[PDB]
Amino acid sequence: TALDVAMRVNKLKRLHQTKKQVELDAWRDLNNLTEAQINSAEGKAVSLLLNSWAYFAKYWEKGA
RNA sequence: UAUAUAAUAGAAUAAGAUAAGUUUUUUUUUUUUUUUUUUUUUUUUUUUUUU
């Protein structure tokens, strides 16, 4: 589901906050999501993914 | 070993038309003019009585 990947990416982002190439990790999870998970995900997971997305994209090489 | 906090100000002063919701004597006083009645006075005519 989406809640578990959201929590794992949140933990990885928090550990990053407290880093070389680590941004590749927890970015594969964002590329992991399929539609069927999204059509039934709750809003808590969505907010977590959005926050993690922004925090990662602060330092991404190219694109977002 | 944590995912999260939030607060500063000031003024004294007025325009103005909408086709609407009562009615319950009429009379008193003063003056002038005309008409009618009564009383008083004067003049004329007629009749009666007295000198």
Say which experimental method was used: cryo-EM
- Residues A16 and A54 sit within 8 Å (Cβ to Cβ): no
- Residues A12 and A25 sit within 8 Å (Cβ to Cβ): yes
To one decimal, the resolution in angstroms is 3.7
| A29 CA from B48 C1′ (Å) | 177
Measured CA distances, A32 to A8, A17, A18, A20 (Å): 12, 22, 25, 22
Q: Which nucleotide is nearest to A17 (CA to C1')?
A: B3
Return the number of other C-beta atoms located less than 10 Å from residue A15's C-beta. Answer: 12
Q: Which nucleotide is nearest to A55 (CA to C1')?
A: B3
Chain B bases under 7 Å from protein CB? 2-3
Cα–Cα distance measured from residue A23 to residue A55, given in angstroms and rounded to the nearest whole number: 10
H-only helix segments in A1-64: 2-17, 27-30, 35-38, 43-57
Cα–Cα distance measured from residue A35 to residue A25, given in angstroms and rounded to the nearest whole number: 21
List of protein residues whose beta carbon is under 7 A from strand B: A 10, 14
